[PDB]
Amino acid sequence: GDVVMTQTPLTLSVTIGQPASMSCKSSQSLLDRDGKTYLNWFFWRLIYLVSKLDSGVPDRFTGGGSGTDFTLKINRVEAEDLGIYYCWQGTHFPQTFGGGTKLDIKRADAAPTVSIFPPSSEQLTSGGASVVCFLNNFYPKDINVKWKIDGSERQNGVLNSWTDQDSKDSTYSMSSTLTLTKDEYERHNSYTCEATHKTSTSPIVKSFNR
Amino acid sequence: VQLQQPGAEFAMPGTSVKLSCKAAGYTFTSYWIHWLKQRPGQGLEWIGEIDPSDSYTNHNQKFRGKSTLTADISSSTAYMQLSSLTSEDSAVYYCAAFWGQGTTLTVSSAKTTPPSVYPLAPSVTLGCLVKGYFPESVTVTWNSVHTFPALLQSGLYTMSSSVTVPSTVTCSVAHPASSTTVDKKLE
């Protein structure tokens, strides 16, 4: 639309007994000239929790303005209630939403188990070459994977897929795949999967030599 | 009260798609019907609105050139037509008055394509790469499992699955749209 709705954090770690707070900052003041301020909160079909800062049917949430800075506080989280929260505006045409805050369960920090796999003989046989790197059971979700070929970072052609929170471990697993052509895969000899995570000052580095 | 949308729609790039939103349990002309877009990990976006009682429509300008909104009193359904479709229109589209469950639109020129199954072999971690199939979805079983959400790339899907054993392992991939089952033994 026009007004930008910046939400933080992207993922808010929660503990099922404790409070929780999220923020929503607008590009422009939501204070309307009719006196009212049209800020809502949705939970994800999507259904809204709050209008203007009052609840209306949820309830246990808050609920706080104003101007360009807004917050949503849960006095005590439950597993209800685990999901994405979007803020919303109508100053203001057109209505815009925020990027959403996803709530996940807070667990002890864990480093990923990194495994790197070269292209199989069958795929090279078909003229393609994919290098696969598994980053398994880590917390929190935030993680950074970097691919290096002969010591030089490769950005193009990398697809990353994350699981959701496990619900048994409360960990995440992610997959990183670097797809080359077969011709350029044989053009290099060192393939490196480098993972940077909060659980270490130094990146976990797994590699193989073609 | 409820709004009925189909679960999924598909379209090749450059064509048009008509998304339906059937109403029941309330008088159809008493509520404006809004449409919303949600790209994966991209917030929600308001597309526009229609007043069923007179067919007046209004649009977010970002979507006005691509979206045509109509409503049918006789059948209590609303429609959004999306034109000149691009890979950036692959998204979930909701109608709202209460919401529909959303329609997942996938833009792709691909035909039904069985996956290629590639074994990923060196606690030992094994996996297999399931690449270049269409459409979703696919069932990978093993004989600690992590199955990773597929990503749409150039009209085709790729996904991966991993298994961790303590130290014969095979992964089984079933693609019902093409009625294929592949089993790959690992080195």
Q: Which residue has the tokens 């917050």?
A: A71
Q: How many domains does chain B have?
A: 2
Q: Which of A47, A120, A132 sits opposite B160 (nearest CB)?
A: A132
Domain at A1-107, CATH homologous superfamily: Immunoglobulins (2.60.40.10)
Residues spanned by the domain of B119 = 110-185
What is the strand order of the sheet A113-117 is part of?
Answer: A113-117, A128-138, A172-181, A158-162
Tell how strand A158-162 and strand A152-154 pair up.
unpaired
CA nearest neighbour of B75 among B17, B1, B20:
B20
Find out if CATH 3.50.50.60 is the number for domain A108-210: no
Q: What is the resolution of this structure in A?
A: 2.3
- B73 min Cα distance to partner chain A (Å): 25
How many interchain CB pairs under 8 A, A with B?
Answer: 102
- Do both B82 and B132 map to the same domain? no
> CB A169: neighbour CB atoms within 10 A?
15
Spatial contact of A174 and A165, defined as CB atoms under 8 Å apart: no
- Residues of B within 8 A of A115 (CB-CB) are 122, 125, 127, 162
Tell how strand A96-97 and strand A47-51 pair up.
unpaired
- Do both B77 and B99 map to the same domain? yes
Spatial contact of B113 and B153, defined as CB atoms under 8 Å apart: no
CA nearest neighbour of B35 among B14, B17, B11:
B17
B154: CB partners within 8 A, 6+ apart: none
d(CA A1, CA A182): 44
**Residue where one domain finishes, among candidates B66, B85, B109:** B109
3-state secondary structure of A76: coil
Q: Which residue has the tokens 């797809």?
A: A179
Question: Residue type at B77?
Answer: T
Q: Which of B62, B127, B150 sits opposite A1 (nearest CB)?
A: B62
Q: Which of B61, B118, B164 sits opposite A123 (nearest CB)?
A: B118
- Breaks after residues in chain A, judged by C–N over 2.5 Å: 44
CATH of the domain at B128: 2.60.40.10
- Residues of B within 8 A of A117 (CB-CB) are 120-122, 127
- Do both B7 and B82 map to the same domain? yes
- Do both B150 and B116 map to the same domain? yes
- Residues of A within 8 A of B45 (CB-CB) are 1, 96-97
Which region, left, alpha or beta, applies to residue A47 given φ > 0 means left and ψ of -120 to 50 means alpha?
Answer: beta
Spatial contact of B19 and B80, defined as CB atoms under 8 Å apart: yes
d(CA A195, CA B8): 36
